[PDB]
A paper describes a structure:
Phosphatidylinositol 5-phosphate 4-kinases (PI5P4Ks) are emerging as attractive therapeutic targets in diseases, such as cancer, immunological disorders, and neurodegeneration, owing to their central role in regulating cell signaling pathways that are either dysfunctional or can be modulated to promote cell survival. One class of these enzymes, the phosphatidylinositol 5-phosphate 4-kinases (PI5P4Ks), is functionally expressed in mammals to regulate cellular levels of their substrate, PI5P, or generate specific pools of the PI(4,5)P2 product. The role of the PI5P4Ks in response to cell starvation, a process that leads to the negative regulation of mTORC1 activity to initiate autophagy, has also been documented. The regulation of mTORC1 by PI5P4Kγ results in the basal activation of the complex, whereas reduced PI5P4Kγ activity in starvation conditions initiates autophagy. PI5P4Kγ is therefore a target for small molecule inhibition in the context of neurodegenerative diseases.
Compound 40 was selected for crystallography owing to its balance of potency and solubility. The most interesting aspect is the presence of two distinct binding pockets for 40 in PI5P4Kγ that cannot be occupied simultaneously by the ligand. The other three monomer chains (A, C, and D) show the ligand located 18 Å away from the ATP site in a lipid-binding pocket. In this protein conformation, residues Gln378, Tyr379, and Asp380 of the activation loop occupy an inhibitory position in the ATP-binding site. Thus, the binding of 40 into the allosteric pocket appears to stabilize a protein conformation where the activation loop inhibits access to the ATP site. The allosteric binding site in the PI5P4Kγ protein is formed by residues Asp161, Met162, Asn165, Leu166, Tyr169, Leu182, Phe185, Phe272, Leu273, Leu276, Asp374, and Thr377 with the isopropylphenyl moiety of 40 inserted deep into a mostly lipophilic pocket. The pyridine substituent of 40 forms a hydrogen bond with the Thr377 hydroxyl group, and the central pyrimidine ring forms a hydrogen bond with the side chain of Asn165. In chain B, where the ligand occupies the ATP site, the allosteric binding site is occupied by residues Ile375 and Leu376, which form the start of a loop that is mostly missing in PI5P4K crystal structures. In the ATP pocket, the ligand interacts with the Met206 backbone NH through the pyridine nitrogen, not the amino pyrimidine moiety commonly associated with kinase hinge binding. The binding mode of 40 found in chains A, C, and D of the complex fits well with the findings from mutational studies and HDX-MS experiments by Clarke et al. that suggested the putative PI5P-binding site of PI5P4Kγ, not the ATP-binding site, to be the likely region of interaction of 1.
Numbering used by the authors:
A (entry chain A): 45 to 135, 139 to 290, 351 to 383, 403 to 420
B (entry chain B): 45 to 292, 351 to 377, 404 to 420
């Protein structure tokens, strides 16, 4: 595909540019309004793999580089992960690094515009909690272009594992209205189940009091932050593996199952799928709901 | 300097793109109309070394890559030579003129009008080079670029150095064999290594002593080189002649004969070039055949 080829070229190009720049000690207001653009135009050359006209734009290169650092990702390992072997495509557009450490989700221009408003607060928040959050870990944000058709790509750390594959998968909002996976959905090998499917299966999460106190104190301040930003309609992604992964929690010793849990916050924007009441209230309902999965 | 920074960035960038492409076995007519352009534009990012706005264009990437190959230059060694260390500047050309740190390459700024002319003859030049197996007194063109910094485009042209990477030139002549007197000005002769001309050559009574075998070869080369320049309707070219007195790769170099009055090394090749002419050639050949 052209869009992926240009994307992988652009990542390689931008990481190389950044190796020349030394990392600042401190970000500045302008670093969050910054970009790097490249317009390439090969006439009667290179016919292989890339198109002859394309653009590539990295949003806030200094901020994303600092976020990669703060989430313990090295710029060379980031490049290796996205380019050394091609990413796989999952069901817009939604790709996983060969090594299954990273996720690349196509988004809309209006999504990029939303991301820009809160990137500064997000950065402050990340510094303040030392990269330790259930929120998505944003690693980079790009606009690849092919003949005046722009496509916005957004890279996040995978909330799921590089090794242990997910057997069951839930999107939990704690809605008053029925949240049920449709029949169309349940024909998939690993379908995205919802609130009602969770309650009907009588699913519980068994992790132990120490681990749970930590997880819920994390979720509380993550959610308080989302309220602060006047954001809502987020879900807890919950993946379960029946028998470095920053979102993973082992089953307690007492547990009725040898299980590993993967939990983090998501959105229509940040969902692990292709692109398709007051916020203080949404939070309280949401927290009640997900406090009762243990 | 911005222009050199962008130039060296572009060379590195263009050689890297070419490492992805495998070299064709055969060029096509389109390879000689081809180009690679890049416009970079960083808003609020990294006002350091490169500017935030610039373009870079490589003319005929496939053709210059084939020419580098045909003149026995490896694309990696070419990149190493232009970028590993910064080039030095000389001030004897009508624009910028740089020498690779390793003194194997020369980078001469030219004009848009020059580039337009030189483009039309690159195909015939390529034919000619294949036909003579890279072995010519003409410049060995290795690459051809347009770096742009603000509104201001500057066309750069890379050639193998006709002079040496080791043995430095002590004396230096530009010979046309003009009807008018060609004389170095007084301003000039104050320089450490001045560019002397026809009349200065004749007055100093300079001769070139190389031996009849080596001279027959050199003159048969110059004849077909010059016949080619006529074919291209080109004139106002000079023979560059540099001399190393033995008091202290090089494809243009010839050692003094045994019988010679001096242990000297000569560097000769054609310059101010790839674009009445029948006349210019005859005068030019007569003149330079009489330097031996
Ligand atoms: C806090 C949020 C992660 C974020 C980080 C950086 C910069 C901006 C944002 C953002 N994220 C959106 N959604 C994604 C989302 C929301 C909640 C949980 C998980 N993922 C947003 C907005 C504004 C409207 N929407 C829909 N801002
Ligand atoms: C065109 C050049 C400006 C020039 C004009 C008149 C007379 C001489 C020269 C000259 N030619 C050098 N190189 C040999 C060379 C030149 C061109 C192509 C290939 N090779 C020079 C310098 C200074 C250092 N070098 C190495 N000047």
């Amino acid at each position: 595909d052209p869009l992926v080829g240009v994307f992988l070229w652009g990542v390689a190009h931008s990481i190389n540019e950044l190796s020349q720049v030394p990392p600042p000690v401190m970000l500045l207001p302008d670093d969050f309004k910054a970009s790097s653009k490249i317009k390439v135009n090969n006439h009667l050359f290179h016919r292989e793999n890339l198109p002859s006209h394309f653009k590539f734009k990295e949003y806030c290169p200094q901020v994303f580089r600092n976020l990669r650092d703060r989430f313990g990702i090295d710029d060379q390992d980031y490049l290796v992960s996205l380019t050394r072997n091609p990413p796989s495509e999952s069901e817009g557009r939604f790709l996983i690094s060969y090594d299954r450490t990273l996720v690349i989700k196509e988004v809309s221009s209006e999504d990029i515009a939303d991301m820009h408003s809160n990137l500064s607060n997000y950065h402050q928040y990340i510094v303040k909690c030392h990269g330790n959050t259930l929120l998505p870990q944003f690693l980079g944000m790009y606009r690849v272009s092919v003949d005046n058709e722009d496509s916005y790509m957004l890279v996040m750390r995978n909330m799921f594992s590089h090794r242990l594959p997910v057997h069951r998968k839930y999107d939990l909002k704690g809605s008053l209205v029925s949240r049920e996976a449709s029949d169309k959905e349940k024909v998939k090998e690993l379908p995205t189940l919802k609130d009602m499917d969770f309650l009907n299966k009588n699913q519980k999460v068994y992790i132990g009091e120490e681990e749970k106190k930590i997880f819920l104190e994390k979720l509380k301040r993550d959610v308080e932050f989302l309220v602060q930003l006047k954001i809502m309609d987020y879900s807890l992604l919950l993946g379960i593996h029946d028998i470095i992964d920053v979102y993973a929690i082992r089953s307690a010793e007492g547990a009725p199952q040898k299980e590993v849990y993967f939990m983090g916050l998501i959105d229509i924007l940040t969902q692990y799928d292709a692109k398709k009441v007051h916020p203080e209230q949404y939070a309280k309902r949401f927290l009640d709901f997900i406090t009762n999965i243990f």
